[PDB]
């Protein structure tokens, strides 16, 4: 269950809320646990939007395509001088 209260999820894990909030947030620090907690109302919500794949393809192309035009700087600026 994504959205859950912190006190009764600490009742399922049988632990105090202080080190439940800090360990769960430590799991968010590890990125293995997708989600975040809420201290104000004592809520914990899980949400994810995994795929970056298209940005990886884009960046891989264009970032190297910089050096591509740098490689064309050699030939096309050689005919000038």
């Amino acid at each position: 269950f994504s959205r859950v209260q912190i006190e009764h999820i600490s009742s399922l894990i049988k632990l105090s809320k202080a080190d439940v909030e800090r360990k769960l947030s430590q799991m968010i620090l590890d990125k293995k646990f997708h989600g975040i907690l809420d201290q104000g109302e004592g809520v914990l919500i899980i949400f994810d939007e995994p795929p970056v794949d298209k940005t990886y393809e884009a960046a891989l192309e264009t970032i190297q395509n910089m050096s591509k035009v740098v490689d064309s700087l050699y030939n096309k600026a050689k005919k000038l001088t």
Binding site: E21, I36, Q39, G40, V52, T55, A58, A59, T62, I63
Partner: protein, 189 residues
């Protein structure tokens, strides 16, 4: 420098303790927090030579302890050692503000909506200090976030999963297509 103690001491390696300070000072920046404690705490051979000097060891275990009341004092001793060592002069200016965003990265990531009253519980004192401190660090470009007061909401954020996701296309494409626009319009004539 992951080899650590396997280099022992040599005339070309100068003082071995200085080499230990070189690797332990540089391992706190680009290394992840679980990877940081995996290097220093889980490392069997490196742990003793970093234990001999309490200055950096205090900064290592307090960084994992997350206490912010000893940070700038331990960073003062670390920075004082950073000033008097050669080749470290150009690199400390970014190294410090990087330790700000390093320690504040685990400060905000605790809760999406954080009550600054809970932050001010044990700080000594963080009521009005974290307001001007973190803000002036946000204005610089370190750990950008939107925090609210008198509503007592520190909202983290901003993932930047929309603009920055598609931004590299147009960003890189700006100078990319610019650099091909030069070579296109130069020749012929």
């Amino acid at each position: 420098f992951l080899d650590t103690v396997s280099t022992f001491t040599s005339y070309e390696l100068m003082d071995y303790k200085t080499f230990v300070t070189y690797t332990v000072y540089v391992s706190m920046i680009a290394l992840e927090r679980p990877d940081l404690r995996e290097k220093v705490i889980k490392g069997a051979e490196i742990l003793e030579v970093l234990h001999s000097l309490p200055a950096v060891r205090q900064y290592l275990f307090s960084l994992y302890e997350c206490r912010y009341s000893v940070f700038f004092q331990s960073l003062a001793v670390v920075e004082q050692e950073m000033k008097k060592d050669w080749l470290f002069a150009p690199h400390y200016r970014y190294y410090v503000r990087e330790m700000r965003i390093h320690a504040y990265s685990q400060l905000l990531e605790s809760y999406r909506s954080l009550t600054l009253g809970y932050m001010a519980e044990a700080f000594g004192v963080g009521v009005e200090f974290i307001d001007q401190e973190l803000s002036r660090f946000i204005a610089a470009g370190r750990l950008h976030c939107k925090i609210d007061k008198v509503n007592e909401i520190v909202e983290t954020n901003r993932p930047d999963s929309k603009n920055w996701q598609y931004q590299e296309t147009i960003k890189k494409g700006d100078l990319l297509l610019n650099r091909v626009q030069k070579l296109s319009r130069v020749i012929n004539m």
